Structures are given as C-alpha cells and as structure tokens.
Amino acid sequence: GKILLLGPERKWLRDFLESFEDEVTQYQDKLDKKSAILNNVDFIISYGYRYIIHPDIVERFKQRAINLHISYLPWNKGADPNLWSFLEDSPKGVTIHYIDSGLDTGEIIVQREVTYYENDTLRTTYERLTQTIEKLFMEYWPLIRLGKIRGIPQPKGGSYHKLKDKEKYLYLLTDGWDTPVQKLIGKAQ
Ligand SMILES: CC(=O)N[C@H]1[C@@H](OP(=O)(O)OP(=O)(O)OC[C@H]2O[C@@H](n3ccc(=O)[nH]c3=O)[C@H](O)[C@@H]2O)O[C@@H](C)[C@H](NC=O)[C@@H]1O
Numbered sequence: 396g397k398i399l400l401l402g403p404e405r406k407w408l409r410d411f412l413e414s415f416e417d418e419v420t421q422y423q424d425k426l427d428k429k430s431a432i433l434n435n436v437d438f439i440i441s442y443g444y445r446y447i448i449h450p451d452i453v454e455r456f457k458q459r460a461i462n463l464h465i466s467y468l469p470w471n472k473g474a475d476p477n478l479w480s481f482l483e484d485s486p487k488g489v490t491i492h493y494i495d496s497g498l499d500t501g502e503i504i505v506q507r508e509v510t511y512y513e514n515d516t517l518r519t520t521y522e523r524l525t526q527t528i529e530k531l532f533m534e535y536w537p538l539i540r541l542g543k544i545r546g547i548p549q550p551k552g553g554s555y556h557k558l559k560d561k562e563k564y565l566y567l568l569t570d571g572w573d574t575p576v577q578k579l580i581g582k583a584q
Contacts, residue, residue, distance in 0.1 A: 448460070478568075482579055505531060521572065
C-alpha cells in the first residue's frame with residue numbers, strides 16, 4: 396500500500412512504515428484539494444502536520460486518515476496541547492483519532508494517559524508524550540493498517556485552543572521549553 400505521511404520527515408517512522416513493505420511519501424506543506432500527492436494514497440497519517448485538511452480530503456479518506464495528537468481528547472484540541480494540559484489542569488496523554496472536519500474532533504481510536512513528575516519541564520513532558528504516542532502508534536498500527544478497528548465518537552466538551560491563545564501566558568515560560576511545569580498548573584483558571 397501507499398502511505399502519505401503529513402508532517403516533518405521522520406526516518407524512524409518511514410523505516411517503520413516501510414518495514415511493512417508499504418510505500419511512504421512525505422509532505423509538510425499546504426495541501427490543495429486536487430494535489431497529485433494524494434493519487435493512489437491508501438492511508439494518511441498526520442503527525443505534526445501544521446495545516447487543516449480540507450473537508451473534501453477528509454470525506455475522501457474518511458476512516459482511512461488518522462492523526463497522532465499529543466493530548467487526551469476531548470481535552471486540548473488544537474494547538475499547544477502539552478502547555479494547555481498544565482495551564483488548565485486537564486487530563487494529559489496522547490490520542491490516535493480518525494481525521495474529520497474540524498480540528499481534532501474525529502472518532503477516538505486509542506488513547507493513553509501520560510503522567511508527569513514534580514521536576515518535569517515542558518520539554519521532558521513533550522518528549523514523554525512524543526515517545527508515548529510514537530510507542531502507542533507502533534503498538535496499534537499493525538491493527539490499524541488492516542482496518543481492524545473502529546473508533547468511538549469523541550465526547551463533546553473537553554477544550555480547544557488556538558496558537559494565539561497562549562500569548563497571554565508566554566511570560567510564564569521563563570526558560571522556554573525548559574520551564575518547569577509546576578509553575579504552570581491551572582494558571583489559566
Ligand atoms: C500546527 C500546530 O500548531 N501544532 C502541530 C504540532 O506541532 P508539533 O509537531 O508538536 O511541534 P511544536 O510546535 O509543538 O514544538 C516543536 C518542538 O518544541 C519543543 N517543544 C514544544 C512544545 C512543548 O510543550 N515542549 C517542547 O519541548 C519540542 O522539541 C518540539 O520538537 O502539535 C500538534 C499537537 C498539532 N495538532 C495535531 O493534531 C499540530 O499538528
């Protein structure tokens with residue numbers, strides 16, 4: 396099969412997907428509805444993709460397009476989920492979900508809670524989320540690749556954030572991504 400990876404290039408993920416004798420193409424720029432990147436694409440995997448996928452593409456690859464989102468949906472849809480999971484003291488984790496119209500609102504395939512520690516920073520928590528979702532994806536990809544799973548509807552509620560929403564809190568990130576998370580718990584409540 397042919398897998399379209401939307402997001403930055405990741406040799407490990409290419410090699411892993413290519414381990415199942417599938418073809419892998421990568422693209423990280425804005426994707427038009429009629430782009431030839433999509434021809435003969437069996438499955439779309441979005442991971443770090445920084446653009447909204449057109450509803451026409453969504454409906455075309457309905458049930459064949461998943462997104463790796465480093466949040467515990469329905470909480471922290473959209474941008475900067477790791478930061479917001481602390482700013483709003485919400486559940487923390489990673490979710491693999493089918494892609495639908497709207498940002499991070501599709502059916503949930505699998506989730507995993509990720510805990511944190513007293514001396515965690517945004518960097519160490521992000522890295523733990525990354526390792527977890529990448530581990531979680533490899534665990535269930537053999538099952539997902541064969542259409543062996545169906546998702547459950549994402550419960551309404553949770554939360555959603557835009558990139559600009561964090562501007563009012565950047566002053567708390569004294570050490571950038573090396574800022575301890577403890578100084579950020581519930582600061583947005
Ligand atoms: C378009 C958009 O707004 N977000 C993307 C995507 O962005 P992402 O690929 O995660 O890259 P990011 O900008 O977050 O940071 C880049 C580097 O900064 C360091 N870092 C950052 C934040 C932190 O809390 N701690 C850190 O240490 C770290 O090293 C990281 O490699 O996140 C998804 C959740 C979004 N939705 C998916 O469904 C979108 O797909």
